[PDB]
């Protein structure tokens, strides 16, 4: 699985910037940043949940510096609902993956 | 063009609004944006971190830690779009080095407060 | 069965806030409604910090069983135990499903402060 | 390979119960735990840090009810030295993997 629901609250797990082939995509963080989030979309809505319930967004990245990057194409996902709380975490992250995101959200 | 904010005076730092050092390590209280005379800072949200900011420095200092030191930073913040805002200035202080953790929670804050920070840091 | 604390009168900055449907608590301490903190162990502290949490949950249209996480503040993890002891009396059918303990500089005479994040129903 | 140093920091991969031939551990969360923290002994010993210097600790499993069963273990280990901070939470774990264990600690 993807995640766990409990309590009517989904607990994915990290998504990673994979294509539906496989292979990491191609190109930079924020290429990377969409294809994480097409994943999450995906995951979210098989839990019954969206973009505009998450909670807390937890963001793993490989460079504290480029999280100004990130955000720039957070914004575009979460452009109704911002998270009430979000982190950043500086983590090893599997091979040629820039960026990794977890998130919590209400089941409705 | 070099951008300088005057650097604020810190508020005076109680015997419980400072923190505690356990095993090495300095969990900072949540700094709010008191001026030395106990008041809230004047000004926006920018004026209100740089003073967090400076109680920051003089609670890091106390405890033997530094910027350069914290490891995790977590900002309280009344609204999360003005977040960017924030951000700015903590980039200003975060500068070379950024801590390797950081949160950002929507809360309840004293009244006038639009923002609040604790950090951890590594006593040298 | 703990007798249960009288609720401290909680002030509109120390209710917490909610964002959409959930409830963040202000961090409850120690206070009995006459302003003052407990004078008592760890344990009946605890009990006083649960039945103030109880207050603010319920004005926010909330209860224990809607808590989705629990942080514990601590000044010494050695006593974590025995508030643990009373956290399971609140939160015994239902256990929030994320909890943390974390050592901190507590308010004057306080043992125990306890945060929680709750559905608003 | 698996976590990551910074800044004197040491914050460790999620531990899982398999034994050192990559096999899930036999028996109930109690003895998983313990390969768990096998585990966590061998990668903290190779970033140059051991038990009595972590600062955080964080548990997943699958229902929060297991807790006091990992805890008696947790216990064993974290006994004259107590983390600082100690964060459970439910979650997706591997197959048959009961408890996960991930760990910061201070690199002298
Ligand atoms: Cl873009
Ligand atoms: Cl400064
Ligand atoms: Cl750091
Ligand atoms: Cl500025
Ligand atoms: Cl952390
Ligand atoms: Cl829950
Ligand atoms: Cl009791
Ligand atoms: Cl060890
Ligand atoms: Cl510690
Ligand atoms: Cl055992
Ligand atoms: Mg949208
Ligand atoms: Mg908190
Ligand atoms: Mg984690
Ligand atoms: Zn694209
Ligand atoms: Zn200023
Ligand atoms: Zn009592």
């Given at each position: 699985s993807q995640g766990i629901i409990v309590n009517n609250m989904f607990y994915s797990s990290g998504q990673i910037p994979l294509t539906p082939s496989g292979e990491?995509?191609?190109?930079?963080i924020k290429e990377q940043t969409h294809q994480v989030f097409s994943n999450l979309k995906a995951v979210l809505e098989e839990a019954g949940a969206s973009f505009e319930t998450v909670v807390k967004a937890t963001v793993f990245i490989?460079?504290?510096?480029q999280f100004a990057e990130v955000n720039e194409v957070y914004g575009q996902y979460f452009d109704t609902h911002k998270p009430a709380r979000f982190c950043v975490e500086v983590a090893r992250l599997?091979?040629?993956?820039l960026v990794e995101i977890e998130v919590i959200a209400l089941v409705k």
């Amino acid at each position: 699985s993807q995640g766990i629901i409990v309590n009517n609250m989904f607990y994915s797990s990290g998504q990673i910037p994979l294509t539906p082939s496989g292979e990491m995509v191609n190109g930079d963080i924020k290429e990377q940043t969409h294809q994480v989030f097409s994943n999450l979309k995906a995951v979210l809505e098989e839990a019954g949940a969206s973009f505009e319930t998450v909670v807390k967004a937890t963001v793993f990245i490989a460079d504290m510096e480029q999280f100004a990057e990130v955000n720039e194409v957070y914004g575009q996902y979460f452009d109704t609902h911002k998270p009430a709380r979000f982190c950043v975490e500086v983590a090893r992250l599997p091979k040629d993956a820039l960026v990794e995101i977890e998130v919590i959200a209400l089941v409705k």
